[PDB]
Amino acid sequence: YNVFPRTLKWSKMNLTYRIVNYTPDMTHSEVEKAFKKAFKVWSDVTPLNFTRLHDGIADIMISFGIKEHGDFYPFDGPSGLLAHAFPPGPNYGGDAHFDDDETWTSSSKGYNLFLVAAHEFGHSLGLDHSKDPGALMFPIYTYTHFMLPDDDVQGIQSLYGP
Numbered sequence: 001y002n003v004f005p006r007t008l009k010w011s012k013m014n015l016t017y018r019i020v021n022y023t024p025d026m027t028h029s030e031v032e033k034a035f036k037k038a039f040k041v042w043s044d045v046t047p048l049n050f051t052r053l054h055d056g057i058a059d060i061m062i063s064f065g066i067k068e069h070g071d072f073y074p075f076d077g078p079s080g081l082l083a084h085a086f087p088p089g090p091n092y093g094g095d096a097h098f099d100d101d102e103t104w105t106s107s108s109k110g111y112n113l114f115l116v117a118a119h120e121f122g123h124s125l126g127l128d129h130s131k132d133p134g135a136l137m138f139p140i141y142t143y144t145h146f147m148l149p150d151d152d153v154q155g156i157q158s159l160y161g162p
């Protein structure tokens with residue numbers, strides 16, 4: 001696994017996240033479950049915890065956008081870039097953005113929100129890309145009870161512990 005050199009981790013165990021807006025292709029419930037399940041992945045192997053706030057500021061501000069959307073790191077329309085998150089830190093730190101130009105699902109068609117989101121929150125927590133083609137933090141999307149690969153388990157625990 002790989003981590004950035006920075007800013008490594010959050011000084012607090014219980015973090016907050018917020019879902020600013022939603023995608024057309026999934027119901028509010030579907031999306032909420034994906035994100036909830038995406039965090040559950042990292043929380044199960046770490047002392048971390050995530051609380052969802054309805055409004056105001058949250059450590060991890062989640063949102064769906066297309067093209068230029070407020071950070072000068074524009075999306076490229078369908079396919080190509082799927083989503084990006086920023087490593088731990090104040091403000092934009094932690095936040096995750098999903099290209100609303102892609103087709104988000106709970107299945108295999110288009111791109112599976114949960115899987116991508118699971119990856120993206122990895123970033124939100126301090127993990128960079130893993131060179132292990134079996135790691136959730138590998139730079140290539142690949143569709144797959146979800147068990148978090150070993151490398152990834154090694155990753156966050158080296159930051160936050162078991």
Ligand SMILES: CC#CCNc1ccc(S(=O)(=O)CC2(C(=O)NO)CCN(C(=O)OC(C)(C)C)CC2)cc1
Nearest residue numbers: 080081082083084085115116119136139140141142
């Ligand atoms: C199992 C599983 C899974 C999900 N994996 C996954 C793979 C690729 C992407 S991506 O298409 O968003 C590629 C990207 C990524 O991995 N985002 O997390 C986007 C952000 N990014 C970026 O802006 O890079 C430059 C500008 C330095 C080229 C690095 C690559 C997203 C999720």
Ligand SMILES: [Ca+2]
Nearest residue numbers: 026027028029
């Ligand atoms: Ca709905």
Ligand SMILES: [Ca+2]
Nearest residue numbers: 059091093094
């Ligand atoms: Ca933030």
Ligand SMILES: [Ca+2]
Nearest residue numbers: 077079080081
């Ligand atoms: Ca794209």
Ligand SMILES: [Zn+2]
Nearest residue numbers: 069071073097
């Ligand atoms: Zn963005």
Ligand SMILES: [Zn+2]
Nearest residue numbers: 119123129139
């Ligand atoms: Zn990535």
